[PDB]
Scaffold this active site. Structure first.
Site, PDB file in Angstrom:
ATOM      1  N   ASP A  32       0.825  -1.168   0.014  1.00 28.32           N
ATOM      2  CA  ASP A  32      -0.127  -0.115   0.202  1.00 28.32           C
ATOM      3  C   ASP A  32       0.938   1.222   0.035  1.00 28.32           C
ATOM      4  O   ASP A  32       2.080   1.012   0.445  1.00 28.32           O
ATOM      5  CB  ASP A  32      -0.931   0.044   1.294  1.00 28.32           C
ATOM      6  CG  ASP A  32      -1.610   1.328   1.185  1.00 28.32           C
ATOM      7  OD1 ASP A  32      -2.432   1.481   0.522  1.00 28.32           O
ATOM      8  OD2 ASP A  32      -1.368   2.196   2.219  1.00 28.32           O
ATOM      9  N   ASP A  34      -0.064   5.147   0.901  1.00 27.07           N
ATOM     10  CA  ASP A  34      -0.438   6.197   1.825  1.00 27.07           C
ATOM     11  C   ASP A  34      -0.495   5.503   3.193  1.00 27.07           C
ATOM     12  O   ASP A  34      -1.242   4.574   3.684  1.00 27.07           O
ATOM     13  CB  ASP A  34      -1.831   6.829   1.472  1.00 27.07           C
ATOM     14  CG  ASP A  34      -1.858   7.629   0.438  1.00 27.07           C
ATOM     15  OD1 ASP A  34      -1.076   8.600   0.129  1.00 27.07           O
ATOM     16  OD2 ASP A  34      -2.546   7.413  -0.415  1.00 27.07           O
TER      17      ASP A  34
HETATM   18 MG   LIG Z   1      -2.899   3.261   3.598  1.00 31.04          MG
END
Ligand SMILES: [Mg+2]
Length: 372
Positions: A32, A34
């Site tokens: 992932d 962010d």
């Molecule tokens: Mg995230």
């Protein structure tokens, strides 16, 4: 037709990859963006601090990168400030030896590409293995099936959020990387989502939350400058993640290699079974009861905190019928707290005890979080 043959082809190709990976002695890692390996913000305060070498936040912003993006609607443009988690370059470099990397973000494709351009300039780490909200197939959740519809036995996921993965057993939840303090995830019904998004971006650019918190910290006459500086570089979660990831790989190929009993398409190791085994030991023996933590409008046993705790071997009860070992309380003298306190054998601790224990993969001493 061109569907029966196609489906058979896609199926052959999928098994090919699984085979390819085992021949390279690697696994697949879904990464992932962010708050997992980066943190982003559009708060212009960052650009201002970065232009002033005498600013208290200047030093920790030296490695920050930025880029511009204009999207969909009416060319709404934004300058994004990106902070890469400490040790990211080495983590990706080293982890690539054991895992084939994929990016899977809820951010837009354009966003993902810019980020990929910076962290993977040669394009060798991720290649084109990048999924964004533009092509993942969902605005609310992520699925292993979007990448490995038939076999997920070799895919590990690292993400700061377990809810978007339904607390999948292949998930290694990471401590959310919050470098830009007060800023959460700038990326969280397409046009309906874009709206509120462009609203959050604007609110951030105009309200300057970073400047607001830094000002508040300074407006409190003190001597210890460090405690008055908003931004800090105290995170080495990636070094810890590397260890866990190296262990999973090692355990997988240990079980895999020792599958000596017709290793064709008979039976192989499964990260989906290995990971839970590793986590189950952490809180095994704990029976948790919550008080003032889970909203009454939300179901307890299906709540994120409960599922997170259970993935680590804890049991979650709803009442005292079966005396819980711990009462997770939210600093409120409720009837549950009073009850547990009167029983004297129940540890009444703050939520932090649980979240920090789960984050450290270690059952911490209740003493530091004890309320009763
Ligand atoms: Mg995230």
């Amino acid at each position: 037709s061109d569907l029966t043959v196609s489906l058979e082809e896609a199926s052959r190709l999928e098994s090919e990859n699984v085979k390819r990976l085992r021949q390279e002695k690697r696994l697949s890692l879904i990464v992932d963006l962010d708050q997992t390996i980066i943190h982003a913000t559009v708060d212009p305060t960052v650009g201002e601090w970065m232009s002033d070498p005498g600013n208290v936040n200047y030093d920790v912003l030296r490695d920050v990168r930025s880029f511009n993006l204009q999207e969909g609607p009416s060319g709404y443009t934004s300058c994004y400030y990106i902070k890469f988690r400490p040790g990211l370059a080495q983590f990706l470099q080293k982890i690539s030896e054991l895992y084939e990397l994929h990016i899977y973000t809820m951010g837009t494709k354009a966003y993902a590409k810019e980020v990929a351009k910076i962290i993977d300039p040669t394009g060798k780490l991720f290649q084109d293995r990048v999924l964004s909200r533009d092509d993942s197939g969902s605005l609310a959740q992520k699925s292993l099936r979007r990448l490995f519809p038939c076999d997920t036995s070799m895919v590990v996921v690292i993400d700061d959020r377990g809810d978007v993965w339904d607390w999948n057993p292949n998930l290694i939840k990471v401590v959310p990387y919050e470098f830009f303090v007060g800023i959460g995830d700038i990326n969280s019904a397409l046009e309906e989502q874009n709206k509120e998004r462009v609203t959050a971006l604007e609110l951030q650019k105009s309200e300057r939350p970073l400047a607001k918190q830094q000002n508040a910290l300074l407006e409190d006459e003190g001597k210890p400058t460090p405690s008055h500086t908003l931004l800090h570089n105290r995170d080495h979660e990636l070094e810890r993640l590397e260890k866990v990831l190296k262990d999973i790989h090692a355990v997988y190929y240990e079980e895999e290699n020792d599958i000596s009993s017709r290793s064709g398409n008979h039976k192989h190791a499964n990260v989906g079974l290995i990971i839970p085994k590793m986590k189950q030991k952490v809180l095994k023996g704990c029976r948790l009861l919550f008080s003032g933590v889970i909203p009454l409008g939300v179901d307890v046993l299906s709540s994120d905190i409960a599922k997170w705790a259970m993935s680590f071997g804890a049991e979650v009860v709803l009442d005292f019928s079966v005396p819980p070992t711990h009462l997770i309380a939210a600093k409120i003298r409720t009837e549950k707290v009073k009850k547990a306190v009167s029983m004297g054998n129940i540890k009444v601790v703050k939520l932090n005890w649980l979240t920090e224990s789960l984050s450290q993969w270690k059952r911490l001493p209740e003493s530091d979080y004890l309320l009763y």
